[PDB]
Ligand binder design. Structure first.
Ligand SMILES: Nc1ncnc2c1ncn2[C@@H]1O[C@H](C[Se]CC[C@H](N)C(=O)O)[C@@H](O)[C@H]1O
Ligand SMILES: Nc1ncnc2c1ncn2[C@@H]1O[C@H](C[Se]CC[C@H](N)C(=O)O)[C@@H](O)[C@H]1O
Lengths: 247, 247
């Protein structure tokens, strides 16, 4: 594997990115994320789409009358976003955001961005900085227990030992990889200057793709309910969470 | 298909029961459960093995110096337990125990006994009655979410719908079935007269059986850590819990 920085990996695949997440599972997950955004973002306001990639969620909010800026360190992702019609795009990393303090009511960090940033402390610090008091961070991240199950399936025993300590493993494709940090419950606990508002599981159950196609509405309603159950969310494929900047 | 009382099913398969559960996975789960018993029963005391079957756990305790009585409504299971060297055996159901009150320090209801009892109110009440103040119930039960995931792979959606309401499904053989009630968190919340001391996941991850044999110590120790993690236990194959009779 060639070891890349995250944005260098995304520079290589930007133009195929959207086509990779058009499976029944990913359609389902997008529908869930979309329903959650409409739940937490009641009214139009100022939003930073951080690591916003090809602009999926920026467009979603633009078309609902929000004032949206997309930020991303991948020049190719940004170019794809611009072509798709995202109006405000900026090249930057989460670790060092070029926006003044208190500029946004909400920051999105969807598609596991905070699992990819190289310095989580600076990243959470910058997010808190750019939000108004009581602003929300709305994010999804990789789940430690899902990674661990996957590693056990792909028989990575020399690697599990390290991973249990670091929570960090490689991700990517057959030829190119970058590092991901998979979150545990204690990672979302007493974050400095944030109140945890909600945590939810995305993909609490695994469904065969065939059944998702056959029964999308039924399965979306089930996952809606299951995502709200605290006792089971760390079973999920990915983790969604919301923080509120303390006053 | 034939529908049976739980103990009628066990009367049919009693002579094969020990042979059926001799697999790598179950060898692993038994090692987990044995280690938990040693943790919670640090001294020889008076134990009731309720639905103790062929006496696996009665014998485990007898050889460690405990005073154990095995109770089970299946005559054939009792006969197998006697032949294996279980000294004290009684034919009864959990819903109506012919023992005096306050007679045991602990009651074991292992191998999902409480998922099979027809009346959990009566069963829980009797258990409470035969325990001394601060006596323990130590038990394992089927996990609702594990059943649901299995059904999502295999069963008609209409069966899933019914199961979401009832938490009950048939178990057994292609030719013989009885009903199991799979537990949720809410079921272990505020049981009258008991304090929940601990809840643990048994078989939090899935392993290929081939790999369980190759890396048994490694897998045992990992599962031992994961079973103590409250955030992930509803992912587990089965649920282990400990209640204390309060005052
Ligand atoms: N340090 C970083 N700061 C901000 N974004 C980053 C950082 N490292 C990687 N990224 C970006 O995170 C994105 C992960 Se892909 C998710 C894209 C979008 N949020 C969606 O959900 O569709 C990539 O576009 C990548 O360039
Ligand atoms: N109402 C009931 N009360 C007590 N035991 C029951 C009841 N219904 C079924 N059982 C018993 O529950 C047992 C489940 Se099999 C488990 C046996 C033993 N506990 C072990 O772990 O190996 C069977 O022996 C069955 O006969």
């Amino acid at each position: 594997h060639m070891k890349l920085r995250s944005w260098e990996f995304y520079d290589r695949i930007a133009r195929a990115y959207d086509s990779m997440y058009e499976t029944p599972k990913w359609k389902l997950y997008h529908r869930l994320i979309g329903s959650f955004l409409e739940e937490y973002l009641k009214n139009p306001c100022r939003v930073l789409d951080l690591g916003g990639g090809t602009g999926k969620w920026s467009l979603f909010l633009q078309e609902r009358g929000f004032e949206v800026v997309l930020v991303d360190p991948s020049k190719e992702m940004l170019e794809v976003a611009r072509e798709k019609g995202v109006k405000n795009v900026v090249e930057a990393k989460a670790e060092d955001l070029p926006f003044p303090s208190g500029a946004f009511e909400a920051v999105l960090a969807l598609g596991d961005v905070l699992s990819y940033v190289e310095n989580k402390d600076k990243a959470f610090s910058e997010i808190r900085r750019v939000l108004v008091p009581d602003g929300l961070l709305i994010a999804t991240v990789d789940n430690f227990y899902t990674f661990l199950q996957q590693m056990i399936e792909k028989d990575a025993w020399d690697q599990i030992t390290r991973f249990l300590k670091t929570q960090t493993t490689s991700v990517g494709t057959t030829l190119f990889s970058f590092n991901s940090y998979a979150f545990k419950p204690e990672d979302l606990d007493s974050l400095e200057g944030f109140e945890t508002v909600d945590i939810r599981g995305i993909g609490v159950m695994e469904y065969p793709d065939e059944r998702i196609s056959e029964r999308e509405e039924t399965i979306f309603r089930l996952e809606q309910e299951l995502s709200r159950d605290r006792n089971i969310i760390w079973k999920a494929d990915h983790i969604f969470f919301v923080l509120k900047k303390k006053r």
